[PDB]
């Protein structure tokens, strides 16, 4: 009678909150639902990062997924990485065609390490190089 009532009142509220956390949770981090990080390994431990998605992969999404990949695939307590993030300027913030020939990417990053830091420095023509 009453137990039943309170138990249903707490599953309904649990599910109210579970769906509120779907919205919030997928909204704050959407860079993974729409943007797929494509990495093109160069000669050594240097790999070139970017992202490929629909029109929902704006420059912010590309930047977040590049940063996530750079800080999650490389451990700087082994040795230290050194990366540069290169913006493509001839591009509006929302630029990917929804279809399948996407085009140029908004943000292109060359991540690296320190044993071949020279290579990263040379690939990053004039952009600032960030050390972690």
């Amino acid at each position: 009678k009453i137990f039943n009532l309170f138990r249903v009142c707490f599953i309904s509220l649990l599910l109210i909150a579970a769906v509120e956390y779907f919205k919030y949770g997928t909204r704050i981090n959407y860079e993974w639902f729409h943007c797929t990080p494509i990495k093109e390994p160069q000669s050594g431990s240097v790999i070139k990062l970017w992202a490929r998605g629909g029109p929902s992969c704006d420059k912010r999404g590309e930047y977040k997924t590049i940063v996530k990949r750079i800080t999650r695939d490389y451990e700087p307590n082994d040795e230290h990485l050194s990366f540069c993030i290169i913006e493509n300027d001839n591009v509006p913030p929302v630029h990917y065609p929804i279809h399948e020939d996407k085009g140029e990417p908004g943000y292109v990053a060359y991540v690296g390490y320190d044993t071949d830091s020279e290579l990263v420095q040379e690939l990053c023509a004039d952009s600032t190089i960030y050390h972690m």
Partner: protein, 315 residues
């Protein structure tokens, strides 16, 4: 004075909710300021007013408002039903217990349906959705903020159905013939209210309220007028057959086809999780399933209604 008090309050069952809400109302109105900075204001009014325009957003205050109206609707129910309805019923001379307790429960459905029926139609009049215009339900889909009245209708009804769902769980006593299809009814009414309110398809939810209220009002009217002596209550059966037919069936078959056809080709159809617009190729199945479940139950009530129409007329 004390156990006289529990017996007194056992009889009547509106006194405790009345005390709670009168205390809250009094404390809110006598504190002087009635601005948004209180706490009683989070509970006794719609929160979120955007700036100083008329468009209110969504949050947890909404849950506080919904719960406090549960408390208010309970008192209403009990007050009304017992105080006016029981007394008018026993003026009436129809005197028994399947018939009177069930006329009494109808009697409160027509009260509230008259109030909600017209509130809802009125609310869709002052808008862009006049006479269920589907083009409009989606022409601007995200809707992170609806209006005053419309937000109030929406949560006034979550406040009202929630509480009834909670009263039929609380296990009053006797269902019988129904409680099964009627529980399908309650749970789906509540998921549509919650879903639609929270995923921003509120202008989808507004038309369906109009259909349900305007049809159910006439249904309960006929049921009461039959429970008493009839005279004409069969004119209320024609009328309810046509209100129900047009409203629930045609109304929602056109809204359901609106869903396939114009969810796609209207508004913005990219998933775009960051903007919180979920009108895409994934949510279309879910929306169609929900309104399809409503339409299934409604033809199930249509079979009950049509069985009764040839039955009664031909027996």
């Amino acid at each position: 004075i004390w156990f006289s008090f529990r017996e007194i309050s056992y009889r009547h069952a509106w006194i405790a909710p009345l005390m709670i809400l009168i205390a809250v109302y009094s404390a809110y109105f006598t504190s002087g300021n009635t601005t948004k900075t209180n706490v009683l204001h989070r509970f006794v009014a719609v929160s979120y007013q955007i700036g100083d325009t008329n468009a209110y957003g969504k949050g947890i205050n909404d849950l506080c408002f919904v719960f406090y109206y549960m408390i208010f609707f309970t008192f209403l129910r009990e007050f009304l039903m017992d105080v006016v309805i029981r007394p008018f019923a026993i003026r009436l001379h129809v005197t028994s217990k399947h018939r009177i307790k069930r006329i009494m429960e109808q009697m409160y459905a027509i009260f509230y349906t008259g109030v909600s029926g017209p509130f809802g139609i009125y609310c869709m009049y002052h808008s862009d959705l006049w006479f269920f215009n589907t083009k409009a339900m989606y022409r601007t889909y995200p809707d992170f903020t609806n209006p005053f009245l419309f937000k109030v209708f929406y949560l006034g009804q979550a406040a009202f159905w929630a509480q009834q769902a909670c009263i039929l769980v609380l296990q009053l006593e006797k269902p019988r013939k129904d409680h099964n299809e009627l529980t399908f009814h309650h749970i789906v009414t509540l998921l549509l209210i919650w879903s639609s309110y929270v995923f921003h398809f509120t202008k989808m939810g507004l038309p369906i309220y109009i259909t349900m209220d305007v049809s159910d009002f006439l249904l309960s009217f006929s049921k009461t007028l039959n429970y008493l002596d009839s005279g004409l209550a069969f004119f209320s059966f024609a009328i309810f057959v046509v209100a129900w037919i047009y409203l629930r069936h045609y109304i929602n078959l056109k809204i359901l086809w609106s869903v396939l056809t114009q969810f796609r080709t209207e508004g913005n159809y990219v998933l775009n999780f960051a903007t919180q617009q979920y009108k895409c190729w994934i949510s279309l199945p879910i929306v169609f399933v929900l309104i399809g479940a409503l339409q299934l139950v409604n033809l199930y009530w249509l079979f009950l209604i049509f069985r009764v129409l040839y039955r009664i007329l031909w027996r």
